[PDB]
């Protein structure tokens, strides 16, 4: 459809990309007995290959003129499962990491030896902050609105 790519469950080049690999695996397989560890491993590999090729066609990815999936990172509603759906969860996880790290730094900074608490972590406080870091957007936006997110008296100097 879009970008001149056909869906993968109709691509006549995907069939070859499957059957050639299957036949290679079977050529490897025919060097043992059907009741030996190499044969079991190879049959498992073949079943995994079939299960993989019978999922891309059902998902809705568009293959190319060479029989290979192509990702439409465009915003297309028929393809949200390629970029934006995993991208949102990644952004969630990364904001989580950053927010809990920032909060740990903020809390440690007001102590006796803050430099000591950075080579020797204090696991109770760090764990508390990691736990509380689940609702980080509702906290980051709240700190932005309340004017608590940024400083103004930065210590940069240039003569």
């Amino acid at each position: 459809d879009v970008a001149g790519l056909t869906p993968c469950k109709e691509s006549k080049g995907f069939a070859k990309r499957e059957k050639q690999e299957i036949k290679k695996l079977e050529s490897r397989l025919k060097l043992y007995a059907p009741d030996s560890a190499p044969a079991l491993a190879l049959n498992a590999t073949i079943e995994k290959t079939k299960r993989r090729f019978a999922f891309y066609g059902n998902e809705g990815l568009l293959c190319g003129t060479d029989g290979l999936p192509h990702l439409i990172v465009d915003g297309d509603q028929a393809h949200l499962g390629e970029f934006v759906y995993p991208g949102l969860v990644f952004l969630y996880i990364a904001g989580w990491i950053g927010w809990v790290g920032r909060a740990y730094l903020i809390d440690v900074r007001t102590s006796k030896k803050p430099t000591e608490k950075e080579i020797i972590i204090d696991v109770p406080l760090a764990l508390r902050i990691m736990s509380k870091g689940l609702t980080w957007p509702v906290a980051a936006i709240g700190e932005l609105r309340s004017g608590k997110l940024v400083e103004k008296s930065a210590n940069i100097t240039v003569s």
Partner: protein, 742 residues
């Protein structure tokens, strides 16, 4: 005089010094103000002579660290044996060592990496190893996975034992300085006890278990029907069936009539015609002789029993006209300084590793070793690299000694002083000979390249045009070829098949060894080897000699062994310490060893290896194109790099895929090294400020201020990444080539 000396419980074992990360040095025990604390912590984590000043604690720490290292080596060995026992096709290999590729590592199927478990043969699937452990176990007489399991456990035990000792002799019973200084008894016990008795024990094992089992393996019997290694110990008749000399009991050895032991104590050159390896009946005799040699050599030095030499009267007695006051004051150097000993030990051990790498390829000591080309190439390259590293380490530690252990108030003993007093001559002449060698070695290649480019090959330096046949090497080859007839009447054959004498030996197809020719293409590369070695010696010796002072900086010893530079003055004084000379010599060592291993690889694939067919016709791998195509740099570019690099690049989708991946990975690491090797600290330290600004803007400023790497750590990182990338690239290339085509 010589006695046991121990201080009961000098250090209480606890966890207090364990919780404070920096504890050994007081300068950084306080805490990490900036982030250049995490770095120098690990930097001087092992600088035992820098933390404290008394030789006693330094010696105790050295002892316990040696014990820890031995424990780690024991864990490594037990792991290798356990893998050979549990995940190896060893028993299948034993039934057909010429069609089964060794393999002792399997990979879990997780993300498609299952294809690394290639079809090695025998109903097994795993990565094909090249350590040569299968050949070693076959030569040892090991014939069952059980006999591996046990020894694995054995290793583990020793590991724990070592660890125990390592703790004990530092925390419960640690010696005192006066005990370590007894070098006479130490050498006595390392000569007679460690080397002599060790060689005697291994000769015993050989002559009792390794000879009959391997002989029955050569007679073509099943490795399962061979009696167990103790049926030849509790049955002298079952062992005498092969070597009937055992029927004569232990009487020939005691009546000096032991010329009747010629069955299992032989003197025969060449290789076993069916295994392509040395005769174990010869190595048993060799070990038996080496053992008594080291034993009678372990009685030279004086202990508290009246007799023996003292290595101070021996030294002072050698004092000639030309050389001032002789070797006086050197016994005081090698017993009150751990570095002046480490230098000599590292130099000798590196040179010995090079000798080993040169001997093993020419006289294969394990059965079916010369046949497996991959193992014989890896065992050369690895050992060469190890020796090349150890010699540079020796240079570095000699420089360290000269920097902070030498003192003149006692070194008026004009041997070290005299060589220190004409450094401006030593280095000048070494520089001149380096220039001469570089020209007369590389300019010849440039001549050949220009001629072959100008359509005039008749003016080249080939074997058809102007010739440069090495006559001395050819004469040595012809002399050793005739030794078993004139200069060695009892040896049945020459020591090696690489000498011009002898003939070819086959191991069922592929060839093992044959007489190696030497033409102009070998003359040129040998002179190139000499030139690179000379340049490395130049750099290292210049550093060592000028470690104390020079015309530029007369007080360099006050600055120390490791420091970036003495200002941008005097025109510039960057990279002026001995550490920087070691930094510069590492690259030339890398260059030299890479040229050596390229030489060996191409020459072996071209003029030694191959697969012979019936009627005698032997076709080498490349086709003998080394004598003609190795005289021009273009030949090394296409006929060696471009041609032989055609296996690794197209290894995708095969069992050799990891080599194709690590090719590009090592290329990336090598190119990554250039960022550190070319840049400098100021630019990065400035750039970091503009990131700390963005951090402060959002209140994420760390308390450990992010300083950039020091001027010396940048160089260290650069050379480390450079060496890793280069060696890993050559590793991947060599293995992916030889595994497929060998």
């Amino acid at each position: 005089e010589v006695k046991i000396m121990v201080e009961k419980d000098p250090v209480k074992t606890s966890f207090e010094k364990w919780a404070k990360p920096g504890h050994f040095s007081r300068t950084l025990a306080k805490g990490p103000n900036t982030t250049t604390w995490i770095w120098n912590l690990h930097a001087d984590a092992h600088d035992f002579d820098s933390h404290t000043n008394d030789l006693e604690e330094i010696s105790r720490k050295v002892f316990s660290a040696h014990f820890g290292q031995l424990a780690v080596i024991f864990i490594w060995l037990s792991g290798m044996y356990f893998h050979g026992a549990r995940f190896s096709n060893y028993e299948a290999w034993l039934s057909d060592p010429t069609h089964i590729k060794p393999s002792a590592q399997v990979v879990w199927p997780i993300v498609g990496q299952k294809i690394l478990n290639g079809d090695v043969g025998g109903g097994f699937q795993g990565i094909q190893i090249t350590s040569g452990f299968f050949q070693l176990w076959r030569a040892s007489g090991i014939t069952s996975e059980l006999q591996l399991y046990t020894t694995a456990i054995g290793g583990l035990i020793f590991a724990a034992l070592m660890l125990f000792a390592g703790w004990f002799h530092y925390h419960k019973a640690a010696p005192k300085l006066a005990w370590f200084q007894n070098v006479e008894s130490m050498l006595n016990h390392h000569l007679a006890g460690l080397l002599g008795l060790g060689s005697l024990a291994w000769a015993g094992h050989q002559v009792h278990v390794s000879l009959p089992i391997n002989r029955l393996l050569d007679a073509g019997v099943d490795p399962k029907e061979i009696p167990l290694p103790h049926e030849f110990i509790l049955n002298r008749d079952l062992l005498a069936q092969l070597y009937p000399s055992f029927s004569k009991g232990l009487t020939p050895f005691f009546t000096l009539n032991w010329s009747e032991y010629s069955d299992f104590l032989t003197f025969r050159g060449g290789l076993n015609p069916v295994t392509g390896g040395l005769w174990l009946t010869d190595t048993a005799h060799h070990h038996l002789a080496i053992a008594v040699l080291f034993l009678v050599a372990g009685h030279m030095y004086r202990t508290n029993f009246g007799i023996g030499h003292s290595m101070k009267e021996i030294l002072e007695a050698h004092k000639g006209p030309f050389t001032g006051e002789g070797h006086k004051g050197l016994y005081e150097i090698l017993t009150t300084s751990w570095h002046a000993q480490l230098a000599i030990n590292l130099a000798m051990l590196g040179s010995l590793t090079i000798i080993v790498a040169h001997h093993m390829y020419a006289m294969p000591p394990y059965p079916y070793l010369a046949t497996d080309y991959a193992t014989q190439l890896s065992l050369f390259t690895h050992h060469m690299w190890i020796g090349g590293f150890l010699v540079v380490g020796a240079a570095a530690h000699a420089a360290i000694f000269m920097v902070r252990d030498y003192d003149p108030t006692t070194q008026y003993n004009n041997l070290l002083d005299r060589v220190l007093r004409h450094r401006d001559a030593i280095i000048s002449h070494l520089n001149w000979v380096c220039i001469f060698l570089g020209f007369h070695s590389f300019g010849l290649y440039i001549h050949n390249d220009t001629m072959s480019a100008l359509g005039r090959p008749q003016d080249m330096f080939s074997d058809t045009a102007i010739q440069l046949q090495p006559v001395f090497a050819q004469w040595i080859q012809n002399t050793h070829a005739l030794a078993p007839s004139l200069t060695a009447p009892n040896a049945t054959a020459s020591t090696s098949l690489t000498w011009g004498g002898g003939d070819l030996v086959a191991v069922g197809g592929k060839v093992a060894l044959l007489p190696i020719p030497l033409g102009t293409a070998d003359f040129l590369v040998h002179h190139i080897h000499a030139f690179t070695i000379h340049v490395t010696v130049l750099i290292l010796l210049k550093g060592v000699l000028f470690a104390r002072s020079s015309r530029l900086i007369p007080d360099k010893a006050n600055l120390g062994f490791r420091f970036p530079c003495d200002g941008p003055g005097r025109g510039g004084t960057c990279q002026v310490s001995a550490w920087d000379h070691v930094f510069l010599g590492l690259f030339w060592m890398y260059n030299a060893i890479s040229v050596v291993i390229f030489h060996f690889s191409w020459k072996m694939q071209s003029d030694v290896w191959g697969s012979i067919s019936d009627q005698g016709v032997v076709t080498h791998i490349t086709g003998g194109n080394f004598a003609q195509s190795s005289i021009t740099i273009n030949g090394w570019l296409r006929d060696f790099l471009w041609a032989q690099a055609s296996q690794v690049i197209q290894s995708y989708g095969s069992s050799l895929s990891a080599y194709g991946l690590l090719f590009l990975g090592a290329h990336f690491v090598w190119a990554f090294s250039l960022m550190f090797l070319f840049s400098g600290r100021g630019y990065w330290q400035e750039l970091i400020e503009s990131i700390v600004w963005a951090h402060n803007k959002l209140k994420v400023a760390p308390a450990i201020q992010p300083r950039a790497l020091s001027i010396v750590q940048g160089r260290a990182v650069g050379v480390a990444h450079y060496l890793l990338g280069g060696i890993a690239t050559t590793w991947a290339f060599f293995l992916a080539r030889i595994i497929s085509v060998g």
